[PDB]
Amino acid sequence: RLNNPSRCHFGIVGSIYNLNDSRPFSLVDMMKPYNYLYDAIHDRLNKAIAS
Amino acid sequence: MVNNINWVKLPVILDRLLRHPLLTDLNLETAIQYTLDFISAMGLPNVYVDKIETIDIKEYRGELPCDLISINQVRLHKNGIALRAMTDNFNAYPTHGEPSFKTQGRVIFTSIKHEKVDISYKAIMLDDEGLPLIPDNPIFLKTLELYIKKEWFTILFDMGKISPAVLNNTQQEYAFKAGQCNNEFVIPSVSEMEAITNMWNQLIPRVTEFRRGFKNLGDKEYIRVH
């Protein structure tokens, strides 16, 4: 930077998609409860189909 | 069946009958005949001994073992493939397939000319004497005792030596225990309800268990994860 000699970084650029200094509650994280419940009910479906 | 079939001799049924002073003229000879009528009329396949014998078929005919009572399956010896049943009316008869068998007496009638076959069958368990051996099940023993008490009292009622209320009680009590004895021998154990569970719950239905000796019948059906 033109005016700050201590301001530098590496090539690594990125971001966390979080809310208010927290750990990111991702799109998969908010859909993973309903995917785990879909796997449990379709298990009951498959044993009902079989018998 | 939940309980195991421990074998006892026929005179153990006579300690129980001769506790009744009207059944004191009973014999082993009468206990032998009334047991075999009772064993037959119940038709419990747990009372019989499973045997397997290989016999050779000469020309669509083979000689059956002497102790045979009911065939479980007949199969071929070299293949293991099982034989179903002869529905042909003109079987070994020429004019001018899937193999089969047919049994009438001590002769089996197959569809194959010159072949050895395994026969899995049921016989009666015998003693050191050539006499029947009965389960020690106090449900079996009680209702065999009530069977003989009902056949002896039926004779005595025809003679006029028994009240009609006495025979009606014996006919009722045999009638209850005969269903309790049927359910005692038929209703599966925990280990037979597991094989019944695996046959019943099948996503890809297994419909050819007769070709084997029903070997893979109670096997569990597995599905891969994908």
DSSP characters over B44-95: -TTSSEEEEEEEEESSS-EEPPTT--EEEEEEETTT-PEE-----SSTT---
Determine the residue type at B152.
W
Q: Name the residue of chain A whose CA is nearest to B197's CA.
A: A51
B93 in contact with chain A, both atoms CB, cutoff 8 A:
no
The backbone torsions φ and ψ at residue B134, rounded to the nearest 5 degrees and listed phi first, read: -110, 155
Give long-range contacts, CB 8 A cutoff, 24+ apart: B65-71: B65/B119, B65/B121, B65/B123, B66/B106, B67/B123, B67/B124, B68/B106, B68/B119, B68/B121, B68/B122, B68/B123, B69/B121, B69/B122, B69/B123, B69/B124, B70/B45, B70/B121, B70/B122, B71/B103, B71/B119, B71/B120, B71/B121, B71/B122
Beta pairing class for B62-63 and B107-110: antiparallel
Residues of B in Cβ contact (< 8 Å) with A39? none
Chain B: closest CA distance from residue A37 (Å) = 17
CB B57 within 8 A of CB B117: yes
Across the A:B interface, residue pairs with CB atoms under 8 Å apart total 9
- The token pair at B92 is 């070994």
Cα separation of B14 and B17, whole Å?
A: 5
Q: Which residues contact B140 (CB under 8 A, 6 or more apart)?
A: B134, B181, B184, B185
Tell me B209's DSSP state. Answer: T
Name the residue facing B200 among A46, A49, A51 (closest C-beta).
Answer: A51
Angle between helices B164-186 and B138-159 (to 10 degrees): 150
Q: Return the SS3 of B115.
A: strand
Q: Across the strands, what pairs with B49?
A: B123
Give the sheet arrangement for strand B107-110, strand by strand.
B62-63, B107-110, B101-103
Q: Is B222 on the interface with A (CB under 8 A)?
A: no
Closest CA to B100 of B57, B64, B156: B57
Which tokens is B157 given?
């009622």
Chain B within 8 Å of A48 (Cβ-Cβ)? no
Resolution in A: 3.1
